[PDB]
Design a protein around this ligand. Structure first.
Ligand SMILES: [Ca+2]
Ligand SMILES: [Ca+2]
Ligand SMILES: [Ca+2]
Ligand SMILES: [Ca+2]
Ligand SMILES: [Ca+2]
Ligand SMILES: [Ca+2]
Lengths: 305, 305, 284, 284, 113, 57, 27
């Protein structure tokens, strides 16, 4: 036995097994990117069926596993569009995968140009084997999407759909996560931009419709999904004797959507992280204000929660 | 080329790559189960420092990866208690891992009996290499914890701590997930029981303290963590002319805790999943009611959100 | 492979310098090298996604009369976002050349041979290899006509097709516009202090990422800010070739310009509407 | 060639922490690893544009008595955009260490070998290999002085000269500044909640991307929201190291600061003047 | 020479330029061989020094009569009185025999104030 | 770094004489193409690199 | 790496190169 060790002032810390997590996890699987139901006669040429950026948040199992890593590298991406309609359905669809996540264009030529794009009748399935970069993209969101996304998928109606068509854009993904870390589950999502424009006189007393903002994800958001505005929203109201204060709100969320507008209506307010609560401000009151734009095109909307 | 295929009424679905996700993922790592700060003179023998059930929710990276699988099997569990105090600190700690998740006992004998338990002075670290079953436990919560947990860790103060002691109970885990599936992120947590008892006359007009319920996780819960009562809470109030209706609430959540009681105060209410919102009912009003017990000992509290 | 090695000469820009405006550190040419300044590369980068610069050799052709003794310094900043227009910054960069207005020199800089993108993005550092800057050392006795030739050999890849607007380049303001010094219904680019904004063509509109608060009178000494996000450009005059910018709602959906509302410039506290670093992007 | 290999040891940061203020989760050092931090590399990144970290090895050297109680967990988050200040974030990353205060450990982090831009830019991941974070594990008994030495080996390239303003690292505020939270003429940096801003030297004037919107009095009730951008650090007293931030104007050329109007103190509904992510950059 | 309870640190370096009269942590740490350590821990500075035949007698320029200078700085705030000794191990190789006067063999000093 | 004698700090000095009077103001810029070979890593102060001047009259 | 050394009350003095001057010089 050993009993010859004197007692020092303090002993060296013996936390040896620290910072030794696994780095590589070759996660794989298949999932549904999107599913759409095209009404008859509304599939006019140029209509965008599915416009989905392929970030590790669309993929659910990858979404819950990209938060325990930081850098992923796509190793096998193969989308498989599957329509479900009888052979009597008349019309065609073109599918493509733009390798540039910032290329927001919806035309037949742009889709067909990209390698791997397909054109087929609505009663015939296809497989888009696209070109995708193998560089180590970043899981967490950033200023530029080009470092956090291999690309985006676009599906377009070529002809005029005779009847309602149910289309599902499946995806096969084989990613290789690396650089172990613990990303926060929020700020892991994808930033969204306001294609439309929001006016001061396009505001109600309390609410405002999402279809005005012109972004589909803003139009379809679950109740309680509080969004973040990079650009301030300066609401007008009468604080006192017509005191038109430009009340600055950055936090927008979708309250219970109005039945009249399925796209729904946001409110402006305070989203307190310390309380994780949404407190509404003074209702909009356009007293004396020349028309103006409050949220311009391209206002980035990221969901704080 | 082939052009001899006639056009049938409908073509066979060609969704081949379906239901083929990876089944085995040998996830591993190290994490901190709990961390405690014992004040001087309050570490009297028998005081429980850490009492933590080892479910795949305590482990964060495993917690975000046990929701994409269903059955895990622990392959290497080795807790490493690390105190941080000078050699002048007087007192001792005993650490053990009860292999029975339902064994809720806190004594020196029970801890020391189990294989792998350690006893050491407060200025000396140790490693608990315990006995743990290799059977395929279930990730999701169920009626019995014995199928969803390898065991629980207990840490106890043997002597009387002379000064404040900061202790961290690290854990090294190497699980082997299997049976691919997509568990919901809620109902993946661990059920909790009310060690204490909640009385009708131990209720305020609106709130009630958590320390009455006698459960530490109930005492420390973030604001907005809505809990579920298996047993109904029949609040008393005056609906009309002393109309004492036994208003049944199953949903309890921790509003902003009162500064006077750090353990805080729950409210009774409705947690609507369709709205995901907490609506409070009529405030408690004991008009004419003999004393009674509303939430007895053992009332299971699982957090709906 | 899909690589297409295009190479050809092109004129980056044409610049006119009025007689006597060659102040200290005056920027004659501030041209970001995006695949639009080059016409052939402009038409050939619309059919590809990634382009890599393999050769770049600028050349100045000052058509100023030999009578003028004003000087010019030419350089290529390899950082597209670099907003430095000082002599030292140019002269440090590889290939920078100094001469007089009657002399013509060449520039052979050290570009970065990495796979840039052919479409605009949030940062210019993945879309352009750099920016040509041509300062006028001293004042010019005669109007200076400047033409800067480019010799590029790009290496395109990743076939695709894009829209003309997607290849445009943003602009940054080198000056801080002040409320106390602001015309009621417009303002010239001198306040902004950016050379591309100085030479901004009439008809272009720039979106200020900062809140363009125009402070209209509510009456009786009370005023109210009005937030805008657009800046229509109008031609100025011979005295001030800078031009004018007017605020309002450049509603590109209607392509109609709500003119700049009345600015009640009486007692606005001293503020900067657009501090140094404010950016402007032509909506087109 | 032009791949200058410069390697040396230097101190990124030093922090003094008083007794009793070492509650778990406190951020002793939160330093983004840009060349501006390292002195020798700081004087060698102003003469180059792109660098590639080839060897990085931080070593924490605390100078405190042996008979002290408390620990320091140190880690290197490989993602500069990451702003996590919890023990979980550090314990997840590779190379993290934990030890008693009198101990000196070595952090062997996981960085990126890709070329990075010395100059600051909008998207930080091209300019920094990560951020070093050092947290207290428990309450410290006495004052602790810690120095985070850094051993680096970079490979600079692309010669060019940069202004000292450009090489400065931008730090985003961790907190949300509310209208009711303001004082008369300034506000404490605790509301910002960012350690680099808290330990910023007095007089370090910053510019904020988010427009600080302080209302100015119109005379009778009527509210007009002035927009002020530049902020100046005002020395932190003994009680509050955070100092203060007086709103106003910092002239670029003149290097002069301005103090704005007093905050409009009335029944204004609560607003977010500066949300989390309000970038601040040293214009000085 | 202080107990382990002494709080504070010292940085030691050897500037190879005898005329470099600068006292900062960065300048010391930059030079090869510099060390940083707590006040209760000894160190060894193995520096970079020129092998050229320097001159023993004083002259107008110190750079021909000195391999360099040593600087020691307090990094932190010393809690108690600290007694420090900067020992040196030297192995010189004298040459060019002559008889220098014992005065004018010393080192010139400058008035900082 | 600067010292008592400039002979160990600089390689020389450019001198540009004007032979005859100028009818017009002469603006002169002298370009340099240098390829130095640094060594002995250290760090110094800005003033330490300055150069003295000598009076010719 | 070695990090298993406890912190004693005081450390042994490490002045090794002491009293080792050259003895013989044939001047
Ligand atoms: Ca991240
Ligand atoms: Ca289940
Ligand atoms: Ca593109
Ligand atoms: Ca640069
Ligand atoms: Ca002599
Ligand atoms: Ca020197």
């Amino acid at each position: 036995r050993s009993n010859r060790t004197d007692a020092p002032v303090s002993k060296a810390s013996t936390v040896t097994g620290f910072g030794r997590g696994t780095n590589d996890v070759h996660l794989s699987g298949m999932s549904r990117i999107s599913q759409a139901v095209l009404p008859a006669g509304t599939g006019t040429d140029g209509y965008v069926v599915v416009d989905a950026t392929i970030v590790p948040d669309l993929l659910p199992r990858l979404g819950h596993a990209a938060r325990i890593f930081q850098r992923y590298a796509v190793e096998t991406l193969e989308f498989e569009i599957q329509p479900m309609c009888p052979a009597n359905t008349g019309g065609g669809y073109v599918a493509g995968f733009l390798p540039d996540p910032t290329d927001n264009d919806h035309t037949f030529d742009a889709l067909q140009a990209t390698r791997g794009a397909v054109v087929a009748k609505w009663w015939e399935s296809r497989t888009v084997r696209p070109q995708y970069t193998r560089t180590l993209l970043w899981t967490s969101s950033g200023k530029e999407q080009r470092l956090t996304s291999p690309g985006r998928l676009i599906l377009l109606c070529v002809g005029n759909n005779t009847d309602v068509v149910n289309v599902s854009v499946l995806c096969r993904w084989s990613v290789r996560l690396s650089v172990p870390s613990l990303e926060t589950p929020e700020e892991t999502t994808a930033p969204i931009m306001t294609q439309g424009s929001l006016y001061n006189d396009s505001l109600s007393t309390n609410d405002f419709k999402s279809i005005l903002l012109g972004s589909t994800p803003l139009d379809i958001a679950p109740d309680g999904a509080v969004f973040q505005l990079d650009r301030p929203l300066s609401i007008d109201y009468s604080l006192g004797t017509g005191d038109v204060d430009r009340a600055v709100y950055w936090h927008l969320k979708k309250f219970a959507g109005n039945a009249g507008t399925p796209a729904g209506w946001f409110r402006w307010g305070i989203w307190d992280n310390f309380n994780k609560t949404f407190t509404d401000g003074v209702a909009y009151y356009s007293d004396e204000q020349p028309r103006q734009i409050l949220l311009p095109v391209g206002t980035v909307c990221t969901r704080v929660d």
